[PDB]
């Protein structure tokens, strides 16, 4: 199964963390990276005093179950990132989001795939489109059609 994972970091100096997270994704059992998007830079949500966000998409080949993949992505978040004391129960300094898991629709207490809001997020769709321009969502909507119709601005490269 090809899973598509969104990497987000809000560290002032995120490259070391992001590269560590990429290596860690590869170390996941029964899984390996197929490709990684360019790194993209987007404005911090709210006040602009905060560093830019680093955004990227990863194609991960895997034979794990979706929940098993989630276990590992959560572990990597714990090991490579930290709580943001400004929003403790929100995203950590490193966020790994499972955007898509093959053509599967998954709804559980701990996991919703496709990611519940990704179709509204240029910062998730653009890096995904770079590595998977022909992508079709489980409901049959085309990634390319969403980007074109919604007219999201392109992102700046890191
Ligand atoms: Cl920078
Ligand atoms: Cl911490
Ligand atoms: Cl869908």
UniProtKB/Swiss-Prot annotation:
In this entry, which stretches build a coiled coil? none
Thermal dependence of function as given in the entry: Thermostable. Retains 75% of its activity after heating 30 minutes at 96 degrees Celsius.
Which pathway features in its UniProt record? Cofactor biosynthesis; tetrahydrofolate biosynthesis; 2-amino-4-hydroxy-6-hydroxymethyl-7,8-dihydropteridine diphosphate from 7,8-dihydroneopterin triphosphate: step 4/4
Which BP terms from GO are recorded?
A: folic acid biosynthetic process; tetrahydrofolate biosynthetic process
If you read the UniProt record, what top EC class would you report for this enzyme, in one word? transferase
Keyword match Kinase: yes
What InterPro entries does the annotation carry?
Answer: Hppk, Hppk_sf
Which domain of life, per UniProt? Bacteria
Q: Which organism is it from?
A: Escherichia coli (strain K12)
Can you say what this protein is called? Answer: 2-amino-4-hydroxy-6-hydroxymethyldihydropteridine pyrophosphokinase
This protein's encoding gene? folK
- Is Acetylation one of the keywords? no
